[PDB]
Design a protein around this motif. Structure first.
Motif, PDB file in Angstrom:
ATOM      1  N   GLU A 105       0.818  -1.233   0.000  1.00 11.93           N
ATOM      2  CA  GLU A 105       0.000   0.000   0.000  1.00 11.93           C
ATOM      3  C   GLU A 105       0.841   1.268   0.000  1.00 11.93           C
ATOM      4  OE1 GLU A 105      -1.289  -2.852   0.268  1.00 11.93           O
ATOM      5  OE2 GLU A 105      -3.303  -1.973   0.381  1.00 11.93           O
ATOM      6  N   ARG A 106       2.066   1.182   0.531  1.00 10.43           N
ATOM      7  CA  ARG A 106       2.775   2.317   1.072  1.00 10.43           C
ATOM      8  C   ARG A 106       1.818   3.017   2.017  1.00 10.43           C
ATOM      9  NH1 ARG A 106       6.968   5.978  -2.228  1.00 10.43           N
ATOM     10  NH2 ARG A 106       8.682   4.465  -2.040  1.00 10.43           N
ATOM     11  N   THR A 107       1.336   2.259   3.002  1.00  8.73           N
ATOM     12  CA  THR A 107       0.304   2.715   3.932  1.00  8.73           C
ATOM     13  C   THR A 107       0.663   4.022   4.605  1.00  8.73           C
ATOM     14  OG1 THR A 107      -0.184   0.427   4.503  1.00  8.73           O
ATOM     15  CG2 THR A 107      -1.035   2.174   6.016  1.00  8.73           C
ATOM     16  N   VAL A 108      -0.246   4.981   4.594  1.00  6.36           N
ATOM     17  CA  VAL A 108       0.081   6.302   5.094  1.00  6.36           C
ATOM     18  C   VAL A 108      -0.259   6.350   6.565  1.00  6.36           C
ATOM     19  CG1 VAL A 108      -0.522   8.747   5.013  1.00  6.36           C
ATOM     20  CG2 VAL A 108      -0.130   7.465   2.916  1.00  6.36           C
ATOM     21  N   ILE A 109       0.681   6.882   7.344  1.00  5.25           N
ATOM     22  CA  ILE A 109       0.573   7.011   8.780  1.00  5.25           C
ATOM     23  C   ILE A 109       0.324   8.472   9.195  1.00  5.25           C
ATOM     24  CG2 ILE A 109       1.958   6.733  10.909  1.00  5.25           C
ATOM     25  CD1 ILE A 109       3.225   4.281   9.190  1.00  5.25           C
ATOM     26  N   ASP A 110       0.943   9.408   8.479  1.00  2.00           N
ATOM     27  CA  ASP A 110       0.760  10.844   8.709  1.00  2.00           C
ATOM     28  C   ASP A 110       0.942  11.584   7.393  1.00  2.00           C
ATOM     29  OD1 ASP A 110       0.369  11.152  11.631  1.00  2.00           O
ATOM     30  OD2 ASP A 110       2.427  10.435  11.762  1.00  2.00           O
ATOM     31  N   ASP A 111       0.228  12.694   7.235  1.00  2.00           N
ATOM     32  CA  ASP A 111       0.207  13.456   5.990  1.00  2.00           C
ATOM     33  C   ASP A 111      -0.290  14.870   6.295  1.00  2.00           C
ATOM     34  OD1 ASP A 111      -0.432  14.586   3.473  1.00  2.00           O
ATOM     35  OD2 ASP A 111      -1.159  12.688   2.682  1.00  2.00           O
ATOM     36  N   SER A 112       0.593  15.845   6.218  1.00  2.00           N
ATOM     37  CA  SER A 112       0.258  17.184   6.664  1.00  2.00           C
ATOM     38  C   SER A 112      -0.792  17.828   5.768  1.00  2.00           C
ATOM     39  CB  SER A 112       1.529  18.049   6.717  1.00  2.00           C
ATOM     40  OG  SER A 112       2.332  17.839   5.560  1.00  2.00           O
ATOM     41  N   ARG A 113      -0.775  17.453   4.495  1.00  2.00           N
ATOM     42  CA  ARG A 113      -1.739  17.959   3.513  1.00  2.00           C
ATOM     43  C   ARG A 113      -3.144  17.545   3.903  1.00  2.00           C
ATOM     44  NH1 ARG A 113       0.331  20.498  -0.471  1.00  2.00           N
ATOM     45  NH2 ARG A 113       2.485  20.109  -1.179  1.00  2.00           N
ATOM     46  N   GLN A 114      -3.263  16.274   4.296  1.00  2.00           N
ATOM     47  CA  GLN A 114      -4.500  15.716   4.835  1.00  2.00           C
ATOM     48  C   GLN A 114      -5.026  16.520   6.027  1.00  2.00           C
ATOM     49  OE1 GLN A 114      -4.971  13.063   7.794  1.00  2.00           O
ATOM     50  NE2 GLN A 114      -7.088  13.744   7.380  1.00  2.00           N
ATOM     51  N   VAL A 115      -4.184  16.816   7.001  1.00  2.00           N
ATOM     52  CA  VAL A 115      -4.626  17.664   8.116  1.00  2.00           C
ATOM     53  C   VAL A 115      -4.894  19.107   7.620  1.00  2.00           C
ATOM     54  CG1 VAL A 115      -3.164  16.183   9.597  1.00  2.00           C
ATOM     55  CG2 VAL A 115      -2.524  18.589   9.293  1.00  2.00           C
ATOM     56  N   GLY A 116      -4.158  19.562   6.604  1.00  2.00           N
ATOM     57  CA  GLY A 116      -4.429  20.841   5.938  1.00  2.00           C
ATOM     58  C   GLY A 116      -3.237  21.774   5.956  1.00  2.00           C
TER      59      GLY A 116
END
Length: 155
Positions: free
Chosen positions: A40-51
């Motif tokens: 998956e390259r599983t995502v754990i954190d993503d700043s874009r997602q938080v905004g």
């Protein structure tokens, strides 16, 4: 590809300009996504997602911090992929914990986030989120994709 043991970099969208002035007390502003090396390259954190993007400050340019090693090899607007071996990634759950707390709007200076955060970890044996708990218990490598956005010199 620069060089420290157990870290493989792969630049994938070059930056506009020469290497910037990464001096002590510089605020580095950037975006990052961190992923397991499963299929998956599983995502754990993503700043874009938080905004909002993430800001850090260079503690000391001669005693550099492991993330600062990555950040400091980046021209502005660069987007780079840093693979990192299990050795460097042990602390990540506790960083991630700390950042996720930042997001909500709270800081170690403030007593509770810290003290209440210690109570909960001791009492319950948890960082407060299952993925970080899963991650702690299965040490492993991680891939961090990072976009350097800005670098400011101190006040």
């Amino acid at each position: 590809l620069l060089n420290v043991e157990g870290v493989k970099k792969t630049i994938l969208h070059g930056g506009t300009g020469e290497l910037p002035n990464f001096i002590t007390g510089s605020r580095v502003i950037f975006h990052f996504r961190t992923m397991k090396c499963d299929e998956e390259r599983t995502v754990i954190d993503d700043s874009r997602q938080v905004g909002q993007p993430m800001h850090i400050i260079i503690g000391n340019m001669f005693k550099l911090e492991v993330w600062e090693i990555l950040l400091t090899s980046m021209r502005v607007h660069e987007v780079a992929e840093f693979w990192c071996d299990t050795i460097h990634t042990g602390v990540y759950p506790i960083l991630s914990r700390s950042l996720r707390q930042m997001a909500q709007g709270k800081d170690p200076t403030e007593w509770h986030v810290h003290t209440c955060g210690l109570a909960n970890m001791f009492a319950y044996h948890t960082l407060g989120y299952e993925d970080l708990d899963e991650l702690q218990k299965e040490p492993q490598p991680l891939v961090f994709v990072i976009e350097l956005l800005q670098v400011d010199a101190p006040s």
